[PDB]
Scaffold this active site. Structure first.
Site, PDB file in Angstrom:
ATOM      1  CD  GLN A   1       2.516  -1.419  -1.809  1.00 46.63           C
ATOM      2  OE1 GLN A   1       1.636  -0.974  -1.007  1.00 46.63           O
ATOM      3  NE2 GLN A   1       3.162  -0.519  -2.410  1.00 46.63           N
TER       4      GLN A   1
ATOM      5  CB  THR B   1       2.227   3.034  -4.147  1.00 49.81           C
ATOM      6  OG1 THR B   1       3.501   2.378  -4.244  1.00 49.81           O
ATOM      7  CG2 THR B   1       1.020   1.760  -4.223  1.00 49.81           C
ATOM      8  CD  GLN B   2      -0.051   6.066  -8.547  1.00 55.42           C
ATOM      9  OE1 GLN B   2       0.259   4.959  -8.840  1.00 55.42           O
ATOM     10  NE2 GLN B   2       0.094   6.842  -9.611  1.00 55.42           N
TER      11      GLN B   2
ATOM     12  CG  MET C   1       9.011   2.856  -5.134  1.00 54.93           C
ATOM     13  SD  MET C   1       8.563   1.166  -5.695  1.00 54.93           S
ATOM     14  CE  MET C   1       7.390   0.528  -4.485  1.00 54.93           C
TER      15      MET C   1
END
Ligand code: MG
Ligand code: MG
Ligand code: MG
Ligand code: MG
Ligand code: MG
Lengths: 222, 226, 204, 233, 195, 212, 196, 195, 196
Positions: A1, D1-2, D107
């Site tokens: 994450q 997010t990755q 993000m």
């Protein structure tokens, strides 16, 4: 994450004198157990005799300082080059910080300067914009090491006058800029000894009616 | 923590920094990380400090009894075998990461040992949070057939790389040199490059500054006669 | 939840010229609730003094345990235990509970009766010895104590100067910690006299 | 997010008396698989700047296109595009640093650590770092990933502070960089022997060296090492 | 269970303990006595997890009664409280710890002094002029801090205790169905049957 | 943290402690927990410091706009409801607030509204909010009367914060006192708890448990 | 890790890289993964270094005690002892071991013991993280009854490719030759095998 | 909040609602009126999550008052309850649903009949002779099932309500600080000031 | 899945197995993984069948609209369109695509687009779960400027090994040859390639 936050270490210290103010900070920038830079300036002259430091996550710190400097610029444009007073700057920074209440600037902000009566002023902010005028405030990694020392040596806490045995407090006599700088240097020397994230260099910005002056001191590099 | 071990011509040298930390706080600024297993077998420990000390004293104790039983001077391979079998049994829960070095009738030896019980052989080794900084120096300057003076220089330089670049390491360099046919020489605070500068101010208080409620004499003596 | 900060409290020890000082706050709490202002954390076995911070049940248990052990030591050895020896006993005793430890931060202070040398030592909850020349700190305001001691301390202080230094170190550290305070005691220890002083401090 | 997929390891760099040096290997890893062996991770912008990128290669290729577009855009309605109004290292960095911080604030980061090395109009050395978090910093030596842990200690022995920069020649600096690349090849499991090195000098301009190899390696001592403790044979 | 209070006055210790026993949804009993007489001049009140409270209290009672018969002698309140603390300190590192907090109110016949000890389930012992367990102290300590005097009579202690219970009944969300009050002095243990 | 406000014959007493903590670390002993919304209205600070500061000075701006538009002092009812309706819009987002909106108007008399970040709005005579609220309630409940003098009411508010400051680990520093009248609030000074405790102990005879 | 053992006309040869990693850090670039449990019974280790060292030490002890009582053990017997430890303690071990040995009666033999603790007798075996990349190559190029020089080339070329593609493999290629003539150690450096 | 009861007798609807407001640890108020007059002959009591209860109640009140002014006409209790149900049924599939349960007691002036409607936060409506929300029904329904008659007077309804409240005060763990009782009949809404 | 594309003297050849699995069940044993996005621009698909079909269909649409306006697209252009879709939608796609095409100006070209959406121009490319087992073999056996017959043998042998070791690969080996002469489909059955 993906974690959008980080910790760049660092420690800052603002002290308000009678007709001056100092904002100091170490010049070490870190992540985890590595040193990124031994000299990365953290305290900034923002114009209008105001100095600022946003300690913690350096990306948010740089963003906030940048946006405040920008706010000073536009305050001049919009209000006939009026000088932004330290109290007005402080309220403005609250709104900058609270604007991101639900995705905060992960920083502890301190600004220093002179109020509209020419007296020394220091304002202290939490990450989401609650603020207060203070006489003395350390921020960042070694804040817990420095503040008790300042309570004792600036405000003379727990110190009483010999012979009276606790009946008469040590009187709160005003400190000179040379006296404050000694306490700042000893605060950072002590913090460097006992905190791994503190070291390399100490940069102090001093604000008086004459303007902003800088002083630099070496700290231990281990 | 930065600890290194370096083989040379007629022996082996180990070195370590002297900073012990709790999180970001420096607990002790002059910690002794070079532990003695036996007179000529020394080790340095990284990880959980109580575990490195405890496992060293236990094996050192058993090594001494073994030496007395067999009428022979202890061997590094015995220390290594006892350490690894103890550490393996506890499956990494004893957080001891050691560099073990020494001389014995067989010759000079240098091993690393890891908390789960795996061991490694080498001419140069580094352990701890400053091991990458130290290994950078070792990989740049190590060569075969180092002299005693070159090995001490290389080892302490590798520790310095940790001291200056690793936040987990700092203060001083301790060194121990174990040469074949000689007494091991422990060089406590071999380098001292981090003495604190004089403070700007003395903080000695005037007597009577602190407010006191009560005073009394504490009886530390035993029950008295008569 | 964190056992080392349920009850709160602090201990600090310092060395001076032919003397040692050990000091502690008097607070026992249940997190936010203050429970007792008379919970002393410094004990002594002969001329060896032991301060213990952390979980209060373990503080009490360990005091009773070291009283137990030093009493048997004395009966067999026919002499009082010394600070250096006792330090090893504390370390041994703590490490025997390696995987079920006492949640404490012990501090030893004393003067060797034969050499006259001042001695202090600290431990983590698991027995690792910190034998500092200057000062040892422990408890929920250990960061504050480290800051105070590092700046206030200077070597070879006379007993009555050391008293002021250690007292101001404790007091100002405790006032920056929610779980420490409610009174304080300072022991000034010399080779054959020990003075105990209760300090006046803010009661919040 | 990755999550990063195809990745490039350390980028290392340092200042010297007349300019900056930057280096990075030619590997595009796919986890522990050393998948792509001809990946250029130093991207020159004009004749005064080299951008070194580690981390996610797909994002690197995106950034490479942003820089290419930046040069095109700067030339539009700009008679001094190859003179006074050419792109500076500081312009290129500030642009990238803005993009990186904006992307992390949405993000959706560009999963990279970037070092912009170059020489300004007035001859000043430029060396500054930016990563996926938008964190920026400058230092006489800069390195990403493993380089930060192993190259920096070595490079800092040459230039330990600002005053060491004028005392450091391009030969000493390049020697230090090349040695660091060897040390990284010894010790980084996601490194390759082949690398690129770029020198941006205020006098001789941009020198871009491709197909360099780690050489003078010590392995002979391995023959004597037997077992893991007690084994003699 | 819920509220247990203690107050040591001039010549006696007074223990007040709630009467309610609640099984989640329903109040099963409103006359429960959360106390055991350990010896003629020592009383222990208790609160904590169901079952463990009574089991622990009766286990302690049995042990003190055994000591009393063996030695033909009543242990001092201090000695009893130390025994109880060790049992709880032993218990906290057991497979399944006793989740029990106690107050021990005793009159020391040797010293002619009342004594109140507060011990929680961890084995945390403190001697106090007044004490409580759970949230009881949060409501009552500010009143006790204000009014308490070490030379109070038993009647004044009961009046201060009434003020504490009134504040509890006002500000506490739970209905604890009043308290049973017992007095421990030189003549032994007796229950105040109107409170 | 300990904040209280109570209605009485002479208006409203507002009393607060001064401590701010981050875990066990005492961040400040000089926090202003009374927000001077305007010369006639006061708000107390508990829960989130920023949330209380920001939205109660914002409230002051709304109150000012109201009286410019309506040419009349805003009621405490209306003022408190502007705040409660605002925080209710944010419900779930994570605002942290527990405040007493205190005022004294012609139509209402002395009025206190407890306003909460989960949308609660309660009118009442005595409110106490914070980690040390239970301690202050004890002193308040046992000594409160409507016919208290301004002097005795001020002391009661001061004494109740002291009770909390003593027992609650997260309360202390100093006591700030306010007296709200129909013609506006009146500040009654900052009182260091350290000095106040010993003063009260001696003069009152309370805290016999503590050695002085 | 890249490890293999190959039987040939005169016996068997074990091969291995020398890289040990902790994540992406190479903790040891000159590791010896070819370990001796008896004079002419060796093994290649993969998986947990602590586990495979512990196992190999116990096996060496067992075969030493076997030899004192019953004379030289067979390679099958050695493999059985390995298997017994790996199978019975499968819940607490991460070990992939190839056992190779030379008898005069049986000649060269190779046994592989994968994670579960099963045993498989094979003409040759490959294991470790790097082996995945050379299943195709080894299957295409292996022949039975190769010469010593051919088997050395086969192992050298195979492990060269395993090292080339696997980041967890690298350093030097170590080899141990087991024949009637005795025990021979070989080492091959990067500059040699990288140009193959 | 906690306990809300309703009982429809011969000629009126009686709503009883607790007075306590508890903020976790402390009882902040003991005189809270958990009800709103929607129209002269329609009363709505409510319980549920803090803030949402009053917000919802006042929102409904505003809408019914708006209807009353627009049409110069009072909606029937049935019509009001249907409006309220739809709002809650709409709310339960919202981003953040109103966590509010209500009782609607009204006197229908057209039919000359009292009517009691029970609606939970999901929009589950039922017309009942007597109703409750939460755990209130668990303690009180067995008494109401036994004693209730459709021809009861208002005074008998109040007596049966007292028995219900007494059972609640006995067996409920929480102290709800008594109830405010209101009567809805042909003459409108009035509060019983002694209960 | 085992897929590859190899440039040679006269152009490029794409190769693929025909097995599609749902866990251990073979849902289709005669799949066509060689898909046409333009006359002489084809691709090999690996990863999610839904994703790679959706992507390929969109690309085919884009290149059809490109052709109507600007004439025949280059293989690079096709790869760029693939990359744009894969990179911009990387969070929601599991696609590993090899793009192969023949221009007359550029001749045979191969581009591989792995999971992240990066592009890599290569002389040849391998992908899919089965490719792991033939990295060694392909690297050792590939040469530039092979003949058509050599390239067919190289692909046939490579995919034979990939199929042999990878359970997710199998069935027939399909191939598509892209040259100036046109488009030629080839198929090779188990009885042919298993005996290689
Ligand atoms: Mg430091
Ligand atoms: Mg305190
Ligand atoms: Mg307090
Ligand atoms: Mg294991
Ligand atoms: Mg490799």
């Amino acid at each position: 994450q993906f974690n959008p936050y980080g910790d760049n270490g660092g420690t800052i210290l603002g002290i308000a004198g009678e007709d001056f103010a100092v904002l100091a900070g170490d010049t070490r920038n870190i992540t985890d157990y590595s040193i990124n830079s031994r000299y990365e300036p953290k305290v900034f002259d923002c114009g209008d005799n105001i100095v600022m430091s946003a300690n913690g996550f350096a990306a948010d710190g740089d963003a906030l300082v940048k946006r405040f400097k920008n706010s000073v610029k536009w305050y001049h444009f919009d209000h006939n080059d009026k000088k932004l007073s330290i109290n007005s700057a402080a309220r403005n920074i609250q709104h900058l910080l609270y604007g991101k209440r639900f995705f905060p600037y992960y920083v502890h902000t301190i600004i220093a300067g002179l109020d509209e009566d020419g007296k020394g002023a220091v304002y202290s902010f939490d990450p989401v914009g609650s603020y207060e005028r203070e006489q003395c405030r350390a921020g960042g990694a070694a804040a817990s090491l420095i503040m008790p020392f300042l309570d004792n040596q600036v405000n003379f806490k727990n110190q009483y006058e010999p012979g009276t045995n606790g009946k008469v407090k040590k009187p709160l006599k005003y400190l000179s800029v040379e006296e404050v700088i000694k306490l700042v240097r000893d605060s950072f020397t002590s913090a460097t000894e006992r905190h791994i994230q503190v070291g390399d260099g100490l940069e102090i910005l001093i604000v008086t009616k004459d303007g902003v002056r800088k002083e630099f001191y070496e700290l231990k590099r281990d | 923590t930065t600890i290194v071990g370096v083989k040379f011509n007629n022996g082996v040298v180990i070195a370590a920094d002297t900073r012990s930390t709790q999180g970001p706080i420096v607990a002790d600024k002059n910690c002794a990380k070079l532990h003695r297993i036996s007179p000529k077998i020394w080790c340095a420990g990284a990880g959980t400090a109580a575990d490195t000390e405890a496992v060293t004293q236990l094996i050192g104790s058993n090594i001494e009894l073994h030496s007395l039983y067999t009428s022979r001077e202890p061997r590094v391979v015995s220390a290594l075998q006892m350490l690894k079998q103890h550490l393996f049994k506890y499956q990494g829960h004893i957080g001891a990461y050691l560099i073990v070095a020494g001389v014995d009738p067989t010759g000079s030896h240098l091993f690393s040992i890891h908390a789960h019980g795996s061991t490694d052989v080498g001419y140069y080794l580094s352990l701890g949070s400053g091991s990458l900084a130290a290994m950078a120096v070792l990989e740049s300057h190590w060569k075969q057939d180092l002299t005693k003076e070159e090995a001490i220089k290389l080892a302490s330089d590798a520790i310095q790389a940790g001291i200056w670049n690793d936040l987990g390491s700092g203060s001083n360099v301790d060194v121990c040199v174990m040469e074949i046919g000689k007494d091991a020489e422990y060089l406590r605070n071999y380098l001292t490059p981090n003495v604190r500068e004089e403070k700007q101010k003395s903080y000695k208080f005037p007597r009577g500054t602190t407010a006191v409620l009560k005073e009394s004499i504490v009886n530390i003596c035993d029950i008295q006669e008569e | 939840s964190d056992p080392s900060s349920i009850n709160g409290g602090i201990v600090v020890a310092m060395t001076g010229k032919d003397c040692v000082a050990i000091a502690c706050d008097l607070r026992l709490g249940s997190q936010s609730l203050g429970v007792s202002n008379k919970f002393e954390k410094i004990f002594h076995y002969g001329h060896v003094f032991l301060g213990i911070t952390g979980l209060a049940t373990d503080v009490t248990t360990l005091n009773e345990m070291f009283r137990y052990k030093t009493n048997l030591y004395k009966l067999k050895e026919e002499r009082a235990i010394e600070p250096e020896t006792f330090t090893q006993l504390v370390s041994s005793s703590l490490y025997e509970r390696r995987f079920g430890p006492y949640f404490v931060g012990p501090v030893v202070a004393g003067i060797n009766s034969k050499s006259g040398k001042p001695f202090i030592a600290g431990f983590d909850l698991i027995g690792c010895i910190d034998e500092a020349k200057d000062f040892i700190v422990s408890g929920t305001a250990s960061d504050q104590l480290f800051g105070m001691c590092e700046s206030l301390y200077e070597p070879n202080l006379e007993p009555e100067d050391l008293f002021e230094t250690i007292s101001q170190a404790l007091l100002n550290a405790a006032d920056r910690d929610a779980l420490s305070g409610w009174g304080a005691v300072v022991y000034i220890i010399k080779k054959d006299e020990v003075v105990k002083r209760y300090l006046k401090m803010r009661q919040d | 997010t990755q999550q990063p997929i195809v990745t490039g390891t350390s980028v290392i760099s340092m200042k010297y008396d007349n300019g900056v040096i930057i280096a990075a290997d030619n590997l595009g890893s796919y986890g522990s698989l050393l998948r792509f062996n001809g990946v250029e991770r130093l991207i020159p912008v004009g004749d005064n700047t080299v951008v070194g990128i580690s981390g996610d290669i797909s994002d690197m290729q995106h950034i490479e296109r942003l820089l290419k577009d930046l040069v095109t855009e700067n030339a539009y309605d700009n008679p001094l595009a190859d003179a006074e109004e050419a792109l500076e290292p500081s312009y290129i960095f500030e642009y990238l640093a803005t993009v990186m911080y904006q992307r992390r604030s949405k993000m959706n980061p560009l999963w990279n650590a970037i070092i912009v090395a170059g020489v300004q109009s007035n001859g000043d050395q430029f060396l500054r770092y930016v990563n996926l978090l938008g964190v920026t910093y400058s230092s006489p030596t800069l390195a990403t990933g493993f380089g930060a842990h192993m190259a920096n200690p070595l490079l800092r022995k040459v230039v330990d502070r600002e005053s060491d920069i004028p005392k450091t020649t391009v030969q000493v600096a390049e020697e230090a960089i090349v040695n660091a690349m060897r040390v990284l090849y010894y010790r980084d499991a996601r490194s390759s022997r082949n690398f690129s090195l770029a020198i941006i000098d205020k006098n001789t301009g941009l020198t871009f060296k491709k197909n360099l190899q780690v050489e003078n390696m010590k392995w002979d001592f391995a023959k004597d090492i037997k077992g893991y403790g007690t084994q003699k044979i | 269970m819920d509220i247990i209070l203690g107050i040591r006055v001039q010549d006696s210790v007074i223990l007040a303990s709630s009467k309610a026993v609640t099984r989640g949804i329903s109040v099963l009993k409103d006359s429960d006595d959360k106390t055991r007489q350990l010896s003629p001049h020592t009383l222990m009140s208790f609160a904590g997890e169901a079952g463990d409270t009574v089991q622990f209290a009766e286990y302690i009672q049995a042990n003190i009664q055994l000591y009393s018969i063996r030695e033909d002698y009543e242990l001092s309140p201090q000695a009893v409280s130390s025994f109880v603390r060790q049992e709880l300190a032993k218990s906290i590192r057991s497979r399944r710890p006793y989740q029990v907090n106690v107050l021990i109110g005793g009159y020391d016949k040797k010293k002619n002094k009342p004594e109140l000890y507060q011990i929680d389930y961890l084995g945390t012992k403190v001697e106090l002029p007044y004490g409580a367990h759970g949230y009881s102290g949060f409501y009552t300590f500010s009143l006790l801090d204000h009014h308490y005097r070490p030379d109070m009579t038993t009647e004044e202690g009961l009046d201060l205790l009434k003020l504490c219970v009134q504040e509890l009944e006002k500000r506490m969300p739970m209905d604890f169905k009043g308290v049973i009050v017992k007095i421990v002095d030189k003549d032994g243990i007796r229950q105040v049957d109107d409170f | 943290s300990t904040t209280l406000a109570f209605r009485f014959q002479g208006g409203i007493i507002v009393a607060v402690d001064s401590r701010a903590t981050a875990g066990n670390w005492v961040a400040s002993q000089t926090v202003k927990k009374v927000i001077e919304i305007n010369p006639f209205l006061l708000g107390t600070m508990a829960g989130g410091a920023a949330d209380c500061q920001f939205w109660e000075t914002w409230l002051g701006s709304q109150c000012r706009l109201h009286e410019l538009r309506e040419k009349e002092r805003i009621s405490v009812a209306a003022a408190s409801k502007i705040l409660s309706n605002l925080v209710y819009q944010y419900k779930g987002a994570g605002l942290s607030m527990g405040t007493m909106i205190c005022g004294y108007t012609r139509k209402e008399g002395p009025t206190i509204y407890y306003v909460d970040s989960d949308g609660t709005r309660l009118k009442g005579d005595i409110f106490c909010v914070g980690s040390g609220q239970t301690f202050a309630y004890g002193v308040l409940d046992s000594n409160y009367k409507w016919d208290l003098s301004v002097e005795d009411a001020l002391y009661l508010g001061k004494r109740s914060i002291l009770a909390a400051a003593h027992r609650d680990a997260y309360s202390g520093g100093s006591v700030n006192l306010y007296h709200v009248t129909e013609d506006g609030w009146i500040y009654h000074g900052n009182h260091d708890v350290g000095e106040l405790f010993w003063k009260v102990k001696e003069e009152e005879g309370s805290f016999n448990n503590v050695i002085g | 890790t890249s490890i293999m053992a190959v039987t040939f006309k005169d016996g068997v040869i074990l091969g291995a890289d020398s890289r040990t990693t902790t994540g992406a850090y190479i903790a040891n670039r000159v590791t010896d993964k070819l370990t001796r449990v008896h004079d002419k019974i060796w093994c290649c280790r993969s998986g947990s270094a602590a586990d495979t060292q512990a196992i190999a030490d116990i096996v060496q002890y067992h075969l030493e005690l076997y030899t004192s009582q019953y004379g030289t053990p067979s390679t099958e017997t050695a493999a059985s002892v390995f298997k017994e430890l790996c199978y019975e303690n499968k819940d607490n071990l991460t070990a992939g071991i190839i056992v190779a040995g030379y008898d005069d009666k049986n000649k060269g033999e190779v046994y592989t013991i994968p994670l579960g603790g099963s045993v498989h007798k094979l003409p040759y075996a490959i294991a470790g993280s790097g082996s995945t990349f050379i299943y195709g190559y080894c299957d295409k190029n292996f022949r039975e009854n190769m010469s010593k020089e051919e088997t050395v080339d086969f192992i050298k070329h195979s492990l060269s490719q395993a090292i080339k593609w696997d980041g967890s493999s690298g350093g030097v290629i170590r080899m141990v030759v087991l024949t009637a003539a005795g025990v021979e150690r070989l080492i091959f450096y990067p500059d040699e095998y990288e140009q193959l």
